[PDB]
Amino acid sequence: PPTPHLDAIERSLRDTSPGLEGSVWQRTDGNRLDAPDGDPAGWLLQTPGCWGDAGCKDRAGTRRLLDKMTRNIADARHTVDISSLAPFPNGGFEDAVVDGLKASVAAGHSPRVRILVGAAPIYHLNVVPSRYRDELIGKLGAAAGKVTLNVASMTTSKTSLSWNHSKLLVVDGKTAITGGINTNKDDYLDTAHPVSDVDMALSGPAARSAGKYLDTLWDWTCRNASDPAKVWLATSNGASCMPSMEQDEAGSAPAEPTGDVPVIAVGGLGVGIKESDPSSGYHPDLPTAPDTKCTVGLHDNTNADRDYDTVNPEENALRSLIASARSHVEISQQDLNATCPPLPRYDIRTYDTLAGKLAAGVKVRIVVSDPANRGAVGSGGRSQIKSLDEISDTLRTRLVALTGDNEKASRALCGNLQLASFRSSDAAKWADGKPYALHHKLVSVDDSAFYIGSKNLYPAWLQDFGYIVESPAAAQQLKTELLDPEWKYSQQAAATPAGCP
């Protein structure tokens, strides 16, 4: 079985970050999409999972995510590895950790547990690591004696806005859940307008790869615990920081297959962890002309930093995933554009790749979160755009900058682009009046290869992680459970680009 999309991404990643192969990105064979019995698409964890129901009475998707997290932790023999954006998991998220950990202890195990959150320099942490660690020890009751805890919150660059954005659950380095879902009860659980998001669950060698990525974050984090402006660290039972928990657990045995699925695991170290990949001979010709409509304040790591790319291979893995589309690509994001300033408006190479696809006849679908979600410049608006025109206009400028002609441009753009804001039912907004907020970080290509993870396509310099899966069978499951429904309701809010029928 040929993996033409994965090959191209592997080639881009080894040219970009060879030194990080085995830690920040790794391709593996023999994985299984970890679906339950009698539900072969159960590996895809959507929330809330209530297509066609503007009232969202039955959050079956939410239910499956929480049970699947509880079960994965209840099966823990040795290690539980959790990362997110702050806060530390609360609500039903914390319950899943608690109930799973008690179950594990009951089976006679002594689980070691790392819990890592990223916090922006602006953000005040209410429940701080030591308070959270006390809370877990509290809720675990008598089982706390057999649980080794490392709890940390981290910021890696205050002046370049970089902290952990990855969303991972890894057990025994054998199972991994990942996606866009932060362990935050107010966005997903206790809401009449819950955010639309998706995780995926699998097992096998690629779970260890997510384990090694977390070892890389925790080697930085344990070490920088000496700079308390960057790291707040709390352990339990007077325990060491455990910067190599996944490596210690994997030992010398290679990971064991559990299925027949080939995966590339891929992440980024953001800014402030590792300056460059010293083993890298990556030397791109960077986008020589950025856009008029905005000028970066900060130094532009997305469009103008070769080193940043060497320690953030996820950037080029997304570009290559899209570049590898031969027939069609679907893109389901919170945004393609970032708030500018401070951050650059968009990723030039990403747009030029898509523009190229439109010029070639490859069909491009983009569903982003409703611009009605937008606020100001930061925390409060789940849309960094004022209008979908800001996406299609940019595809025009790049298409023109490609074909010179503008008639070639409008033929490429108007003939091949679908652009819409996300809808999950017929109604334009939730029953309680708030708009649909879409938090997907999803790219699917030729119904063969797809990415599910935490890296948005819009510029952001955080630490992130995800899986790129090549599997026609699995991409068909993705198409059926997520993409086709998404378009069924989202085409109502489609936008015909400026200059077309």
Curated annotation (Swiss-Prot):
Its EC number is 3.1.4.4. It is found in: Secreted. This is Phospholipase D. SUPFAM superfamilies: Phospholipase D/nuclease. Optimum temperature is 60 degrees Celsius in both directions. It is an enzyme of class 3 (hydrolase). Residues 160-187, 434-461 form the PLD phosphodiesterase domain. May be useful in the production of emulsifiers. One of its GO terms (biological process) is cardiolipin biosynthetic process. Its main location: secreted.
